[PDB]
């Protein structure tokens, strides 16, 4: 449950038994011949794995520096890496004998993923969402109802994500005998940070095979965006022992670090305990969660996974920021140059990769983790542009 | 750490302001055997809707940690009723465990419950608590097995605080039944009491104290600065007077 | 040129020289080692090729009949089979030494497909669009622009698709020395109908290999939707010499054939000569093109490919229709049941497949060509629901 | 099939209605050595913007195929000026090739140009046209090679119709004419298309047997409609230098 000093299981006694059941269930089914056979069947047959590793020939020539490969997670079913974890946990829940999935969502991206996975394996899906978020995400809400899920608007307090979390946890505490709670990222109490990483590790395994196939050697740098950490850990983890490979997590710089409107939890946060984990969080003088901002909705989260805090600590991974403006240029630049419309979360990774590539030799190799497609971001990008 | 048969009001500090919380405590003190005082937190993952709203209210009006201690200190000028501080771990963690508990003791805090600090992560907390003259409160739920409930009891030096998963649930009386059977410590119940039938019934089944939170904070939520008299009428109803 | 009595090159003398240079160039590069090596490189790394063959285990068991596999073209880059042809013709244009692509569109899906492939291969891209269609398809116009193409609104005449075709063909006659005209379906004058099929035959070649891998045998039926013919012909062609396998084209029944608000060209249209091809067209008493309708934008086309007309004559393929109501019922059904939100075009093929499964035993097999994802169709489906 | 140095008005049939077209033909007859008459069609691929519009004006006004033949039958009551029928292949295909050309001949039509019927697809069409007493007309563009132009000429029994690709007569259009006069045995008419007197005189001087006028005339029919007659005559007078 620890990653160095970070991680843990800082929850009340009401949530201990459901987590201890999940620890046990993961332990037996994690390396089970039949569990992994089913997981790999669904990932291949339903999700479309493996995803290709694409050489951005035009983009690298433009920059004039290092080679830039995109790990095309935009091409998985749903349009983001989140499907990998959605299936993984939903299948684990079915192997536990659960008949129902619950989760909570802000932007709706995790709600859609959870609903899709529940639809596949034939499970009841109740998704808690803040009443503010339901009006904001008209189209994501509808998308969940198409997939057989039903959204529960929570009308108390802030009417934000945080209020939906509380409703989801109160619901799990009472229904855990037949219900599994699905966490979207490498965050929260143990065993969720390890479970989610393990279900995203496919990205890095595939990418390592693919880069050895294309280059005959490991890459010099790997760049990936970091909100909670999910996609970044998926691609990072298999390269952690490869001393050559530089790991660069890219957080939301927002309107700039001087402005204070961002979600760079690793760059500008303090270590604290929220959401059941000791990790980095963005907090005020009094040690309360601050409001965060990012143009990319998936990066708008004040916390960060405890494993990233650990990598930061021991200096295995380097963590950086990219502004709304910079990510937006990358969004446009990749669409023009490679004919790929990246998700605004991924555009952060692409944006930094492009800066880094200019300063590197033409024989060096960068793998950018293109965490999703940006069809969902067209309403946002149209209004701003 | 309180007289048997007692009623224990739970209020969130700084809801709607620190002066109001002190007024409420002073008005309720003649009715109470002990008091729980909640410390506002941004993301309170345990608490039910009515208490959750009070955390939102208190921080929206600019509550600060030093104001909780001010309330306990200014309350101690009039009363020596046991105070139990109910907080999440992050205030304790960021201030330093000893620094927090020392400052809590100086105000006149008698006990403390860290809501989101499990038993297996509290080996150090209980140790320093004893050294700084502060008693520990740990909570148990209905799903808590008999193996842990003993370990919960062993680490508690004040009272074990029983809560429910959700008039009063069948599963909640089973928890209380088991607790009196297993625990050497005293037991306070926080099962969401709203009426006199419940206070009497829980004292009858052996609860040493009956905590009253939601019923009082609902009133504070409705009335604000003017809650004092409505709180008294509610506490009088629950004491049957 | 011909498929039985259908097809041809019925265009004016102005368009002969451009078409003959395209004939010669296709005959040159079609079987070329380097053209095909590059084509499969882009299909693999960029497009995400191959796509999986999904077994709809819950949809088959709910129906209680024949097995129902889905060819997952929804997973290709761009969310639709169209990308296959778009890359093929764009690459062909590049090998011909052309710097520029032109096309026209109504719904916008083809205009996006062309814009994507052009951006990939560094081609300049001008799309011609009817100014009414520009007003409707705000988001596809924006998508094209993001992808680097400039959308040229034509304000002459009706301001609809056929006015854009005229403007596009006039431009080609002038600029064909450095410009390729990119037809989006198996339609129009030779060589486009054969060219588009060939670039879509991949779908059938994969499906064949994949169903043998899964079941050890060829399918009993193959079901696919038919607007112009592109996707259906792509999955059909490699099974044309297999006498076992039945081929079924699903046209747009719309609001019903008796109501006259359909786009089923084969089932209830007469043979004629428009757009440079002898084929089935929806015409009036005077032999002029009647207006067409379907809820799925991609099926709303009065013509159909000449090769489908040929397969209809020789009875190598059956052809049927499905109503807007039934496609909507299938759109919702496949979403709830399998976690896959199909395109409204594909939902026609699914809707028929669901019927046809009831009349076949559990050991018999159906392959439905799931031509695209329905993220594009959510506004349309939200309004009617 | 027409006098050298002739002006050839192109109108679209049933634009705005069958009677109004006949009125224009009767008004323009004394200025013209021959006449082209277009048959409306839903999807005209070859034609430019001005003609394209007139196809839609005619079909929005409820044009029937029979009415094209009615104009020529009615026009033949007053005149023996050559009529060329300009159409797409669908109406011919639909009715039957012998049936269309016999009915056209019977109406009093001399020539026919099938716009979207290429030279190689016209083997059976030119064979039946001779049999039915209709003279064939085939068009050539600038991008038409010398090879194909000979084939176009070989199959033409009326006149070769030269056209430019899209102000002024383009340099590319005069190159097509000069080549056609070297190669073709048939007469040559040119739709370049014309708007001023300098253009007509120049084209005849460089060997054009006929100068066709479509867009200048149908643009007036677009503006004026039923009332176009007098403005058409004024325009033709300008082009003839009258």
From Swiss-Prot, chains A, C:
One of its GO terms (molecular function) is tryptophan synthase activity. Pathway: Amino-acid biosynthesis; L-tryptophan biosynthesis; L-tryptophan from chorismate: step 5/5. Keywords: Amino-acid biosynthesis, Aromatic amino acid biosynthesis, Lyase, Pyridoxal phosphate, Tryptophan biosynthesis. The modification N6-(pyridoxal phosphate)lysine is found at residue 82. GO terms for cellular component: cytoplasm. InterPro entries: Trp_synth_b_CS, Trp_synth_beta, Trp_synth_beta/beta-like, TrpB-like_PALP, TrpB-like_PALP_sf. Its cofactor is pyridoxal 5'-phosphate. CDD domains: Trp-synth_B (cd06446). Its EC number is 4.2.1.20. The keyword Lyase applies. It catalyses: (1S,2R)-1-C-(indol-3-yl)glycerol 3-phosphate + L-serine = D-glyceraldehyde 3-phosphate + L-tryptophan + H2O. Disulfide bonds: none annotated. Gene3D superfamilies: 3.40.50.1100. Belongs to the TrpB family. The beta subunit is responsible for the synthesis of L-tryptophan from indole and L-serine. Tetramer of two alpha and two beta chains. This is Tryptophan synthase beta chain 1.
UniProtKB/Swiss-Prot annotation, chain D:
One of its GO terms (cellular component) is cytosol. GO terms for molecular function: tryptophan synthase activity. The active site is at 36 (proton acceptor), 47 (proton acceptor). It catalyses: (1S,2R)-1-C-(indol-3-yl)glycerol 3-phosphate + L-serine = D-glyceraldehyde 3-phosphate + L-tryptophan + H2O. Pathway: Amino-acid biosynthesis; L-tryptophan biosynthesis; L-tryptophan from chorismate: step 5/5. It holds the Pfam family Trp_syntA. InterPro entries: Aldolase_TIM, RibuloseP-bd_barrel, Trp_synthase_alpha_AS, Trp_synthase_suA. Keywords: Amino-acid biosynthesis, Aromatic amino acid biosynthesis, Lyase, Tryptophan biosynthesis. It comes from the Archaea. Its EC number is 4.2.1.20. The keyword Amino-acid biosynthesis applies. HAMAP family: Trp_synth_alpha. Belongs to the TrpA family. The alpha subunit is responsible for the aldol cleavage of indoleglycerol phosphate to indole and glyceraldehyde 3-phosphate. Tetramer of two alpha and two beta chains. This is Tryptophan synthase alpha chain. The gene is trpA.
